[PDB]
């Protein structure tokens, strides 16, 4: 799991 939960 990456540490950015936003849309790229």
């Amino acid at each position, epitope marked *: 799991m990456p*540490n*950015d*939960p936003n*849309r790229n």
Partner: antibody
């Protein structure tokens, strides 16, 4: 502007349930991951959970895993925290929070919080 | 979980003097992209937290320039160069490199007048 408004907090008996909601507006809500952070009265901030922008990935503190579920409805611009088997230690102000300009490893927008009192 | 330890927990400093809050980490906060995701938040009584620093040393827009952030490997440090009266409150560090994200215990800043 970016605006989050939590609701749903109140008095709840230990072992009962409570659904917190957080209402978002002013930004494209379905592009941002959402977090729950709580603060026991007079104690420190504690990150609780996150949900991805599309709702795929979720992640919880161990102390709430199995009892709390984070979810969201993108069609309603609304964040949810479903709290079951509430303990007295769950007493706190619950904030919803996001990272707007960037969401990577940071938080920069918070609600005003809602107070959950776990008491008979 | 990554344990953020802050010191001091309470800090009393006379107006105009410098003040600094430190945060230590049980694990490296260097992410695979090469950044360290250490954040500093200010919180006034009855107020949502307000970010001051992100990625160790970047100061948030509209945050006064007496605030700075730096890293000594040993630890991370929030600095207020000249303490002003409006700086009472709590201060927290936060790592967002590892899930679960975690704060330090907090630091209370009292003015000595």
């Amino acid at each position: 502007q970016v605006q989050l408004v939590e609701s749903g907090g109140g008095v709840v008996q230990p072992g009962r349930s409570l659904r917190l909601s957080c209402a978002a507006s002013g930004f494209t809500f379905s592009s941002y991951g959402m977090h729950w952070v709580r603060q026991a009265p007079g104690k420190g901030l504690e990150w609780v959970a996150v949900i991805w922008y599309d709702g795929s990935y979720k992640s919880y503190i161990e102390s709430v895993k199995g009892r709390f579920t984070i979810s969201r409805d993108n069609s309603k611009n609304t964040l949810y925290l479903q709290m079951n088997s509430l303990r007295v230690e769950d007493t706190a102000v619950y904030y919803c929070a996001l990272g707007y300009s960037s969401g990577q490893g940071t938080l920069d927008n918070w609600g005003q919080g809602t107070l959950v009192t776990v008491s008979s | 979980d990554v344990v953020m330890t802050q010191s001091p927990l309470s800090l009393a400093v006379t107006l105009g003097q410098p003040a600094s809050i430190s945060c230590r980490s049980t694990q490296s906060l260097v992410y695979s992209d090469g950044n360290t995701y250490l954040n500093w938040f200010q919180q006034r009584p009855g107020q949502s937290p307000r970010r001051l620093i992100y990625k160790v040393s970047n100061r948030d827009s509209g945050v006064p320039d007496r605030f700075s952030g730096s890293e000594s490997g040993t630890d991370f440090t929030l600095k207020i160069s000249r303490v002003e009266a409006e700086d009472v409150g709590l201060y927290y560090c936060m790592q967002g490199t590892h899930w679960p994200w975690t704060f330090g215990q907090g630091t209370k800043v009292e003015i000595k007048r």
